[PDB]
């Protein structure tokens, strides 16, 4: 049923060496489609 990957799609961590940002392939799918509708007229 519930999965950690589904619960979180983006992770941001600050380290002494810099910053790290991780995103799941699933997070990408939502973002492209959401944008596709954004360009499209309502």
From Swiss-Prot:
Residue numbers on the Cytoplasmic membrane side: 2-42
UniProt subcellular location: Mitochondrion outer membrane
Modified residues (N-acetylalanine): 2
Induction or repression: Up-regulated by fatty acids.
Superkingdom per UniProt: Eukaryota
Tissue spec. comment: Strong expression in kidney and heart, and lower in liver and skeletal muscle.
Free-text comment about domains: A conformation change in the N-terminal region spanning the first 42 residues plays an important role in the regulation of enzyme activity by malonyl-CoA.
Disease per UniProt entry: Carnitine palmitoyltransferase 1A deficiency: Rare autosomal recessive metabolic disorder of long-chain fatty acid oxidation characterized by severe episodes of hypoketotic hypoglycemia usually occurring after fasting or illness. Onset is in infancy or early childhood.
Family: Belongs to the carnitine/choline acetyltransferase family.
Subunit structure: Homohexamer and homotrimer. Identified in a complex that contains at least CPT1A, ACSL1 and VDAC1. Also identified in complexes with ACSL1 and VDAC2 and VDAC3. Interacts with ZDHHC4.
Biological function: Catalyzes the transfer of the acyl group of long-chain fatty acid-CoA conjugates onto carnitine, an essential step for the mitochondrial uptake of long-chain fatty acids and their subsequent beta-oxidation in the mitochondrion. Also possesses a lysine succinyltransferase activity that can regulate enzymatic activity of substrate proteins such as ENO1 and metabolism independent of its classical carnitine O-palmitoyltransferase activity. Plays an important role in hepatic triglyceride metabolism.
Protein's name in the database: Carnitine O-palmitoyltransferase 1, liver isoform
UniProt organism field: Homo sapiens (Human)
Encoding gene, per UniProt annotation: CPT1A
Residues of the full protein shown: 1 to 42 of 773
């Amino acid at each position: 049923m519930a999965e950690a990957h589904q619960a979180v799609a983006f992770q941001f961590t600050v380290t002494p060496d810099g910053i790290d940002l991780r995103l799941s392939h699933e997070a990408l799918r939502q973002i492209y489609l959401s944008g596709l509708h954004s360009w499209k007229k309502k």
